[PDB]
């Protein structure tokens, strides 16, 4: 059980009709932002729009990242959710545009669900069935193959098309060890057995137990793949001794700008498959925090990328005011985002906290960290948070607990928090020390 | 399984009589062999007087 600045956040604490409770899901306050994020979550679960962009703005330590993590939690692990800091797009190997497109495509998911019919079990016996030749001939003619299968509680003999004979011949099936066959496609797969495992003195052949239940089996298999996986698998080779495989193994295959033709082919085949009802599309979420670090070129490419028809929903986080956009020196914009992109997305405000909210936050964080604090020190911690910062009070909890445990105590008292104040400083006191000292400090 | 000081005993047809001894300080016993076991043994030949190791995980017999 390890905690790191989070894991006390479980959802938005919403309710039917989309009204946020004051205290729910590890959340206090921020009612309007939680309601807006719930509306966004409903829009995501609708799975109809494409390329909808929201930017949530506010001051530092105001729960900007917690909101995105909460909506990711509410959406569920099934839907894709790609987190990204703005400084990750600058890659040495590939241009920033292709990396942005790769992360853009990684948020779209596809679920493949399908059924299979299986006859799996331990071979009882196998025999060809001689029959009259359909044409004039002088020799044995096999019209069926009888294979008997026994598993736990089940047994059944089957007559099969003799042409499948080679499938046994290639599979080295033997008799009585294992078998596992598909129903319609034909062919056989050899999955020895525990019935003869101890019979031999020693053998380098693996043994599997008797399959459970009826020999005939219905199996439903479901998996999920992001479109980026399909593109990278289509582009990248596979195999054994082929020259291309040797070239790939000997070259350290750094990333390459995948062409648009491959993406279009993948899109076409995926559309064909979802037309047949075997696959389903699941748009995801692309979360980018600290967008102020993005260059103007990335913003311009995002302008075009958001207008595609297979775009995911992109959420952006920023904590800047009137700032110059990176890559330029004469454009000054709110949140460090160019106005043309700002015109394309929806703003979500975020307000600072009050002292009582800070006290509740500290109490909840102390409870989630397995610590006990009474009011006589909780009030001092709240005053510290209101004076220095909320994050400073949040960080000071663990040293206080360690100091309490050192003195063979269990409860955090005023002395422990005062000693932690003396030992560890905040930013303001550090700057005050820096200014008043003239020894290269 | 370690301590394969064997002095193998292999003479039907197709390299029949699949048996070999195994000795150590406190144990000594004779093991019969299967077709796949001898097929593995013929590759990486054991001189019947060399300490060799082998796992029961149906894997590879390792020269020591």
């Amino acid at each position: 059980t390890r905690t790191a600045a989070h894991t006390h956040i479980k959802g938005l604490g919403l309710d039917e009709s989309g009204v946020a409770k004051r205290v729910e899901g590890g959340f206090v306050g921020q009612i309007e932002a939680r309601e807006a994020c719930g509306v966004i979550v409903d829009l995501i679960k609708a799975k109809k729009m494409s390329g909808r962009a929201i930017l949530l703005a506010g001051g530092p330590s105001t729960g900007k990242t917690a909101l995105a993590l909460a909506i990711s939690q509410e959406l569920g692990p099934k839907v894709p959710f790609c987190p990204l800091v703005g400084s990750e797009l600058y890659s040495v190997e590939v241009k920033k545009t292709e990396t942005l497109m790769e992360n853009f495509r990684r948020a779209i998911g596809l679920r493949i669900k399908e059924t299979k019919e299986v006859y799996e079990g331990e071979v009882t016996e196998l025999t060809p069935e001689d029959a009259e030749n359909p044409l004039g001939g002088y020799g044995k003619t096999i019209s069926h193959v009888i294979v008997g299968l026994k598993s736990a509680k089940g047994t059944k003999t089957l007559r099969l098309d003799p042409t499948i004979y080679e499938s046994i011949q290639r599979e080295k099936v033997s008799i009585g060890d294992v078998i596992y066959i598909e129903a319609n496609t034909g062919a056989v797969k050899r999955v020895r057995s525990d019935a003869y495992a101890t019979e031999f003195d020693l053998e380098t052949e693996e043994y599997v137990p008797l399959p459970k239940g009826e020999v005939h089996k219905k199996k439903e298999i479901v998996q999920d793949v992001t479109l980026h996986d399909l593109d990278v698998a289509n582009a990248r080779p596979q195999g054994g001794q082929d020259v291309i495989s040797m070239m790939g193994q000997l070259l350290k295959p750094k990333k390459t700008e995948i062409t648009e033709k491959l993406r279009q082919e993948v899109n076409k085949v995926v559309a064909k498959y979802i037309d047949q009802g075997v696959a389903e599309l699941i748009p995801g979420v692309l979360f980018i925090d600290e967008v102020n670090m993005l260059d103007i070129e990335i913003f311009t490419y995002l302008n075009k990328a958001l207008e595609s028809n297979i775009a995911p929903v992109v959420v952006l986080a920023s904590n800047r005011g009137m700032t110059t956009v990176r890559g330029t020196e004469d454009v000054i914009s709110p949140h460090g985002v160019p106005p043309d992109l700002i015109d394309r997305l929806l703003i979500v405000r975020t307000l600072p906290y009050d002292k009582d909210e800070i006290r509740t936050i500290i109490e909840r964080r102390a409870t989630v960290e397995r610590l006990q604090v009474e009011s006589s020190a909780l009030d001092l911690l709240a005053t510290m948070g209101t004076e220095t910062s909320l994050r400073y009070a949040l960080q000071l909890l663990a040293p206080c607990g360690i100091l309490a445990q050192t003195s063979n105590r269990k409860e955090i008292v005023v002395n422990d928090v005062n000693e932690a104040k003396l030992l560890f400083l905040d930013a303001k006191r550090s700057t005050k020390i820096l200014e008043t000292s003239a020894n290269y400090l | 399984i370690e301590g394969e000081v064997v002095e193998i005993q292999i003479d039907t047809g197709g390299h029949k009589q699949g048996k070999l001894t195994i000795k150590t300080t406190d144990m000594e016993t004779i093991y019969e062999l299967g077709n796949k076991m001898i097929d593995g043994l013929t590759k990486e030949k054991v001189l019947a007087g060399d300490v060799i190791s082998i796992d029961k995980a149906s894997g590879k017999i390792t020269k020591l």
């Binding site: 060809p128 044995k140 004979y165 011949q169 | 047809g13 197709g14 699949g18 001898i38």
Partner: peptide, 26 residues
């Protein structure tokens, strides 16, 4: 002509246990 049983079934029987196993079966 069939030298020994159904030849396909013959080789099936051979790969049931193996050549050496077939020799030592008796």
């Amino acid at each position: 002509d069939f030298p020994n049983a159904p030849p396909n079934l013959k080789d099936f029987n051979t790969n049931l246990f193996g050549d050496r196993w077939s020799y030592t079966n008796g």
